[PDB]
Design a protein around this ligand. Structure first.
Ligand SMILES: [Mg+2]
Ligand SMILES: [Mg+2]
Ligand SMILES: [Mg+2]
Ligand SMILES: [Mg+2]
Ligand SMILES: [Mg+2]
Ligand SMILES: [Mg+2]
Ligand SMILES: [Mg+2]
Ligand SMILES: [Mg+2]
Ligand SMILES: [Mg+2]
Ligand SMILES: [Mg+2]
Ligand SMILES: [Mg+2]
Lengths: 157, 49, 202, 289, 167, 63
RNA sequence: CCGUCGCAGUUUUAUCCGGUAAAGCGAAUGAUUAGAGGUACCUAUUCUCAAACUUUAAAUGGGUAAGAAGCCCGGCUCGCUGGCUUGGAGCCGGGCGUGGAAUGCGAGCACGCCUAGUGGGCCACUUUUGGUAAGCAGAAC
RNA sequence: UGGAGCAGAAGGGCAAAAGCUCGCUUGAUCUUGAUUUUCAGUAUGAAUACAGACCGUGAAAGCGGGGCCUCACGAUCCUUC
RNA sequence: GCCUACGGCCACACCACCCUGAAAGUGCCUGAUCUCGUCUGAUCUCAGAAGCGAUACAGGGUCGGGCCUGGUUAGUACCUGGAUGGGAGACCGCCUGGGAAUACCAGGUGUCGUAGGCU
């Protein structure tokens, strides 16, 4: 049976990328993490303090507590049949803002702007995203030249 | 398969030899792709409808 | 030893001779290049390969026997210095053998021999010589097929000798100073270096 | 022979350091402990005093770190002292105290805190720390960015620090690195510190050179004689500078200068010029043979 | 331009004694009488059975002179060598050195208390501006057209002291 | 008399037999593990929140 | 009933995670073949490889998000934070559905409360370990 | 560019660092609760992030309640402090 | 056009070599009385302004190495799902979708923010 070590199997997970070793850039510490924002989790081997467990690597949760150079995240962890909201404490070197959450907050700012701009004009604009619809009918010009004839090539060695 | 058995319920095809119409979009064709060995679909005309 | 029927298929992961697999005996095949190796590229334009068709393991014993069977025919038919045989399969996969059988308690065996994992379409043995010795290479490579398991087919490559350039373009690249011979092979000369090397060539 | 250590595989695996590190300007180990604000402060500016000493100028800045770069709030230079009287000796401990005092008075004048916190108008060289007044806006809390200098007793980065603390800035510090701290007795003498603040150590050196050799006094203090500065005038020159700084600490610049925008460097060659240069070299080599 | 004049950065004297003890403390007073400054003891890096040296044991003493006193000690060292150095004494990095077999010829009178010792004179040359590779703030390389070669080092020795360089 | 050691064969069926259930999202989540210094001041903000109830009624009338 | 909550072994959109297949070793570590050039090395090439190697790097797969528990406007509380309503969090009033991806579907009560039986499994596609192999032994789905 | 070292097995991390050397030290101290990992989500062991004291250090920002991280340890009863 | 101080991204920024550089700035440079530190004022700290662009620094150059981007390799290798497909087997083809990486070739080679300053 395997060992239950905390960093067992994290040879490549917590390792630094190629030519990305050294000191941690400063902007990683300059990002503000308020309570309730969606942040990603990714362990960084350069800083061993406040390191997330190997199960939370690549996971995502919202911040509930904020301390000095460390935040608390409510991460979902499915064990057997019960997804569990885990309250973990990791430092800011192991977290990044989820761009998926920021892309949604921008859609709300535009939706609230479109429905407000449409009310002032009386028009009705759409806000619901629709999947890729079947391509509408269209004409395809040959340009005078005929289509290039293709055929299977013979077998060579 | 559990993933195939879940898509066949979302199409209301819970038994053999039943049919439901599907509004074709990218979110629907990929569902029809996950259950191709279990379904036989196409494009019905007006007489079929 | 056991027959090759026991270690013919690539059933395990590659088990090389490393700091963890100690006690491996020496392979049977130690010489991979025979004939006149220190020959110019223009000496032996034609080349013929022994392409495999099975995904199997060729034993170092079979690699050495097929090497001798192909060398003894090229010497007898093309002279001792009219060819260059290059075996392109080095035995790196170590085989394990269980003890002379308490039966399976601790069954992980000790090293027995070494095989070379060949792929479908991979070259086993290459022979380069004169163009008029084309039929002699086909027969030399045919006699060495019986020293191997599985199925192999003899292919005459379109390349120029042991190089990676086609024979149709090889003459043109030599005149344009793009290929210069260095012993058995040639060096590709691109136009993407310091200009001092270009002046040295011309 | 010896293998080429800086071979092709060397530069493939070589990871360059930061640009500020490769230039030897920023100590990134001390920066994260100096500019990074606590995460429970939520964009509260963490200001710091950037004191730098060049061969001729003393830079005193106040900035806070941001993602797009540091934001310089206020900047005072030692070459601005001629506006306040100090003409020569712009890179001494007395000049560092002036540009440090100018930085503290120019910053407070920009935040309106000049009428609330004045510090020590009279210079005594003793331990001083400004206190916040109830009902008044809080004192500007700042920290010292010494940089890469060996912070020993007497470094000019602590002269500008003393000028900022006497100006009204609330910077945590001690009297251990001020010139006048006896390391043996573990006691700080404020009278020795006041001598370095007014440049009295320069006067004791100018007088000693006059009483020893004029040839060395002229070689060492050429511009002091060119401007007429004497040894007995140093203390009163900086006093009129410390008074003139507190009176008019604001900065005034020139409106604009319209130039012809002449390019002085070499224009970078295009792709067509590099190709033609090779073709001409190839044509010249084959022609000489 | 005057910013390329070759000069003596430092004269590094070395007296590597085979063993420590009273034999080593005598050599320390030899460098003190010559250089006028306290020497520095050099402990052994590793242990060697044949050399009879143990790890972290002082076996040598060394000094370094910078100002005009370095030119004084070099002049007394070159006088013993008759102002002639072999061509291989000059390194490709621009420096050179020579060995003195007895310190009594340098100007130190012999005494029965301390024995006789041999020094190791090595001169480190440089141009004004070589300090940019040693300072902490904004450190930079010296440059190709500014570092001293073996030719400029030998030519400098044939001009300041008019010495003879044997092939 | 050996037996089987470890198995997760039929466990996915047992887990999905009743479905993997996530905890029901409740407004005003529990404030456990938050900064105690932060919780002190937040209690004082709610303790004296009624102190400005008169100013709230006055400002709402201006709208 | 539409509608709205709520739900999902599924897609779509958005955004992260990984180091397996393959590939690479004229790139690091390790292994390895043959000549060539310069003077046993050294440079430029060349043959063959890694499960406890890797610059690269999928497919499948994992996490989160896709709104009213929101948005917007105006205030209040604080003993925390502080150059300065400066943050932060909480609270109050008012205004705004086009419910703000597709599809299917009733959910919730730490999936409540008590709870029997079981805790010798075995087999197959694929993946995979020991073994010459096994109607062998041991895993993943 | 670390090809050295970092007490040890290995992996990861690490260059005006976490290595080496030096001078000041005892945050290896006194406490409450929460959290992570093995987990039944029990205990132990080992960790994480705070808070309240009292200190160390540095000019300071800060950093430190053991060892750069992943191992190096022990219930009831009883005895002893 | 350019230079400082502080930076963000951290090689398109590095490395080797060569050429050029107004003005200010920076650096070199000149000293050791005080501050301070060394075996030594080289480094460090301090004091200073006689000297120049040597170097640092900046710009440019190299059929430059590397790096970066793209092409190519390639719909190749690999792969999801499927079949009472082939084959003694090893394995391979097709269906449904997804889809690489060297060699090779081409192009590019720092950029942005804050403050002050020079043409
Ligand atoms: Mg194990
Ligand atoms: Mg059992
Ligand atoms: Mg067991
Ligand atoms: Mg039960
Ligand atoms: Mg039971
Ligand atoms: Mg039983
Ligand atoms: Mg079985
Ligand atoms: Mg059995
Ligand atoms: Mg504490
Ligand atoms: Mg290039
Ligand atoms: Mg490419």
């Amino acid at each position: 049976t395997n060992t239950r070590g905390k960093r067992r199997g994290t040879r490549y997970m917590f390792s630094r990328p190629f030519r990305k070793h050294g000191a941690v850039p400063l902007s990683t510490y300059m990002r503000i993490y308020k309570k309730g924002d969606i942040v990603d989790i990714k362990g960084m081997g350069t800083i061993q303090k406040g390191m997330p467990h190997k199960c939370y690597h690549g996971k995502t949760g919202r911040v509930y507590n904020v301390t000095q150079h460390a935040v608390g995240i409510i991460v979902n962890k499915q064990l057997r049949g019960q997804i569990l909201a885990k309250r973990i404490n990791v430092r800011v070197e192991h977290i990044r803002h989820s761009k998926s959450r920021d892309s949604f907050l921008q859609r709300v700012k535009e939706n609230e702007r479109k429905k407000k701009e449409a009310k002032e004009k009386g028009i009705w604009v759409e806000l619901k995203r629709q999947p890729a619809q079947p391509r509408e009918a269209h004409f395809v010009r040959t340009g005078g030249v005929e289509p290039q004839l293709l055929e299977p090539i013979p077998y060579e060695f | 398969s559990p993933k195939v058995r879940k898509v066949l319920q979302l199409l209301r095809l819970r038994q053999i030899f039943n049919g439901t119409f599907v509004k074709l979009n990218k979110a629907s064709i990929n569902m029809l792709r996950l259950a191709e060995p279990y379904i036989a679909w196409g494009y019905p005309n007006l007489k079929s409808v | 030893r056991r027959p090759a029927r026991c270690y013919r298929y690539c059933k395990n992961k590659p088990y090389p001779k490393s700091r963890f697999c100690r006690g491996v005996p020496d392979p049977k095949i130690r010489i991979f290049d025979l004939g006149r190796k220190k020959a110019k590229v223009d000496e032996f334009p034609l080349c013929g390969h022994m392409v495999s068709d099975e995904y199997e393991q060729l034993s170092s014993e079979a690699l050495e026997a097929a090497r001798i069977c192909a060398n003894k025919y090229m010497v007898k038919s093309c002279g001792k210095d009219g060819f260059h045989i290059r075996v392109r399969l080095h035995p790196f996969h170590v085989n394990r053998i269980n003890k002379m059988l308490t039966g399976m308690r601790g069954a992980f065996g000790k090293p027995q021999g070494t095989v070379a994992r060949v792929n479908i379409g991979q070259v086993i043995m290459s022979i380069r010589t004169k163009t008029q010795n084309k039929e002699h290479v086909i027969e030399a490579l045919r006699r060495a097929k019986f020293k191997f398991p599985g199925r192999q087919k003899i292919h005459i490559s379109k390349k120029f000798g042991f190089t990676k350039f086609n024979a149709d373009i090889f003459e043109s690249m030599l005149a344009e100073k793009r290929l210069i011979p260095d012993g058995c092979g040639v060096k590709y000369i691109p136009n993407r270096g310091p200009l001092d090397k270009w002046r040295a060539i011309h | 022979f010896v293998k080429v250590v800086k071979n092709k595989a060397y530069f493939k695996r070589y990871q360059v350091k930061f640009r500020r590190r490769r230039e030897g300007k920023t100590d990134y180990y001390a920066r994260k402990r100096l500019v990074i604000q606590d995460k429970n402060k939520y964009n509260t500016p963490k200001y710091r005093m950037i004191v730098r000493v060049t061969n001729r100028d003393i830079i005193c800045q106040i900035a806070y770190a941001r993602i797009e770069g540091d934001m310089i709030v206020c900047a005072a230079y030692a070459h601005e002292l001629p506006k306040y009287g100090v003409k020569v000796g712009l890179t001494n401990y007395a000049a560092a105290y002036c540009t440090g005092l100018l930085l503290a008075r120019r910053l407070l004048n920009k935040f309106g805190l000049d009428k609330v916190y004045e510090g020590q108008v009279e210079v005594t060289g003793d331990e001083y720390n400004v206190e916040s007044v109830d009902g008044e806006p809080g004192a500007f809390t700042c920290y010292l960015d010494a940089g890469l200098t060996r912070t020993t007793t007497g470094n000019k980065v602590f002269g500008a620090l003393k000028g900022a603390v006497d100006g009204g800035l609330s910077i945590p510090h001690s009297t251990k690195r001020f010139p006048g701290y006896d390391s043996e007795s573990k006691e700080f003498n404020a009278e020795v510190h006041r001598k370095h603040i007014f440049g009295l150590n320069i006067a004791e050196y100018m007088r000693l050179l006059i009483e020893e050799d004029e040839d060395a006094y002229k070689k060492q203090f050429s511009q002091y004689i060119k401007n007429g500065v004497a040894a007995d005038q140093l203390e009163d020159i900086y006093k009129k500078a410390h008074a003139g700084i507190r009176e008019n600490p604001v900065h005034e610049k020139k409106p604009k200068k319209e130039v012809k925008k002449k390019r002085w460097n070499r224009a970078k060659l295009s792709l067509e010029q590099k190709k033609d240069r090779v073709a001409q070299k190839k044509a010249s080599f084959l022609r000489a043979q | 331009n005057p910013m390329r004049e070759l000069r003596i950065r430092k004269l590094c004297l070395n007296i590597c004694v085979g063993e420590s003890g009273d034999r080593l403390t005598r050599a320390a007073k030899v460098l003190e009488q010559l250089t006028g400054q306290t020497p520095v003891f050099s402990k052994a890096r590793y242990t060697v059975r044949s050399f009879g040296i143990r790890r972290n044991e002082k076996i040598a003493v060394h000094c370094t002179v910078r100002g005009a006193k370095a030119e004084e000690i070099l002049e007394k060292g070159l006088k013993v060598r008759e102002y002639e150095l072999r061509k291989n004494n000059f390194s490709d990095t621009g420096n050179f050195g020579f060995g003195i077999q007895e310190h009594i010829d340098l100007g130190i009178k012999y005494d029965p208390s301390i024995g006789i010792y041999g020094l190791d004179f090595y001169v480190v040359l440089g141009r004004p501006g070589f300090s940019i590779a040693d300072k902490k703030r904004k450190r930079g390389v010296i440059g190709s057209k500014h570092r001293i070669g073996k030719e400029e080092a030998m030519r400098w020795f044939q001009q300041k002291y008019d010495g003879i360089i044997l092939p | 008399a050996k037996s089987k050691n470890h198995t997760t064969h039929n466990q996915s069926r047992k887990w999905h037999r009743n479905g993997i259930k996530k905890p029901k999202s409740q407004r005003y989540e529990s404030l456990k593990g938050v900064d105690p210094k932060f919780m002190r001041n937040m209690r004082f903000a709610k303790k004296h929140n009624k102190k400005g109830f008169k100013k709230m009624l006055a400002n709402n009338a201006k709208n």
